[PDB]
């Protein structure tokens, strides 16, 4: 769509109405808009760096910067075809944001498929309040989940305790297993201890599933019977 002109110039078109006398009274917005000018450039802006990984955009490596031979054993003495194509479009295309943590996150849930079954809440509370010390995995305010492992792994690589990402990741994974085992026992024991003191529960999870399966299996029984009788009539033909 064409860059519109009349929406940002209401003050100037109004000013012509007032100066000529076509409009007798100044509108209430008139003074407010005059003191706060609208932005009216609507230009495309170049970008020279990917904010996620700091990669520089718009830099050409000259042959003088590649004095040594390549992986093929050949020296570079002249620009190649790619070097001779204008790359202005890359300056204007929104950069693809990438993060190393994304690679680890995919790995964690590939190794632990059932961690996906633990519901995650995407609704944020207040990102600015998060005061986390990733020297330890547990944190007050956030659940223990795959993200706890990833942030712990990054802290280890950031503090240079471990050099390889794999080693830091493995170290964090074991800390995660220990915390997961202590919680699986606290829940089992809590249920056992309550039943031993006379706690009663209406429906268990296993019972809930049986009831839901019965509701479905009852409708399925009717339809099967109905469709096993239309077939008999239709086939009789």
């Amino acid at each position: 769509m064409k860059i519109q002109t009349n929406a940002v110039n209401v003050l100037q078109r109004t000013s012509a109405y007032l100066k000529s006398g076509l409009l007798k009274e100044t509108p209430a917005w008139y003074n407010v808009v005059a003191s706060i000018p609208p932005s009216t450039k609507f230009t495309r802006e170049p970008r020279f760096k990917n904010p996620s990984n700091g990669h520089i955009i718009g830099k050409l490596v000259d042959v003088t910067e590649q004095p040594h031979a390549n992986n093929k054993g050949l020296y570079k003495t002249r620009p190649n075809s790619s070097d001779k194509r204008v790359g202005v479009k890359r300056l204007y295309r929104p950069p693809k944001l990438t993060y190393v943590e994304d690679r680890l996150r995919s790995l964690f849930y590939k190794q632990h498929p059932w961690e996906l079954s633990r519901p995650k809440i995407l609704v944020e509370n207040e990102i600015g309040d998060e005061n986390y010390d990733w020297s330890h995995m547990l944190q007050i305010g956030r659940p223990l989940d795959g993200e706890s492992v990833i942030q712990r792994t990054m802290y280890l690589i950031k503090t240079k305790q471990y050099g390889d990402m794999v080693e830091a990741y493995d170290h964090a994974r074991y800390e995660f297993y220990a915390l997961r085992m202590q919680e699986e026992t606290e829940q089992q024991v809590a249920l056992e201890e309550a039943e031993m003191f006379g706690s009663l529960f209406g429906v268990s999870a296993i019972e809930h599933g049986i009831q839901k399966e019965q509701e479905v299996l009852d409708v399925w029984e009717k339809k099967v019977v109905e469709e096993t009788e239309l077939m008999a009539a239709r086939t009789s033909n």
């Binding site: 904010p51 996620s52 944001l97 993060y99 943590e101 994304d102 996150r105 995919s106 964690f108 849930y109 498929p113 059932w114 996906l116 079954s117 633990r118 519901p119 995650k120 809440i121 995407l122 609704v123 944020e124 990102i127 989940d145 795959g146 993200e147 990833i150 942030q151 074991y174 297993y177 997961r180 085992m181 699986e184 829940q187 089992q188 268990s204 999870a205 296993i206 809930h208 599933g209």
Partner: protein, 114 residues
């Protein structure tokens, strides 16, 4: 910076997944991360995604692939039922054992070149 915050955002925490939301083969384990919304947010169609989920959805659990698409819809299925399978396994109190008697993968054992 904004880029640093985005990498740690709750949406970034969900690993990219394009596996079919409607799969008719053999299912052995969860394939999509379950998303949960609170009752208050559900009343306002807020799930922490890009767009509001349609009001028709009454469940508080869903699974999605893409935040937005060329069809101007979210690709999601309003189900969270793999969690109940895990919790029902927990209620049966049967520990998982190795039929090959291998070392426990959750313990940092000192293994050798056997």
């Amino acid at each position: 910076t904004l880029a640093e915050l985005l990498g740690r955002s709750r949406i970034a925490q969900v690993a990219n997944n394009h596996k079919p939301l409607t799969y008719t083969g053999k299912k052995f384990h969860p394939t999509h991360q379950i998303i949960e919304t609170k009752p208050s947010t559900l009343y306002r169609q807020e799930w922490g995604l890009k767009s509001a989920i349609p009001s028709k959805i009454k469940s508080r659990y869903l699974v999605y692939n893409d935040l937005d698409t060329l069809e101007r819809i979210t690709t999601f299925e309003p189900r969270g039922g793999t969690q109940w399978n895990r919790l029902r396994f927990q209620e049966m109190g049967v520990p998982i054992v190795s039929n090959i008697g291998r070392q426990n993968p959750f313990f940092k054992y000192i293994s050798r070149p056997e």
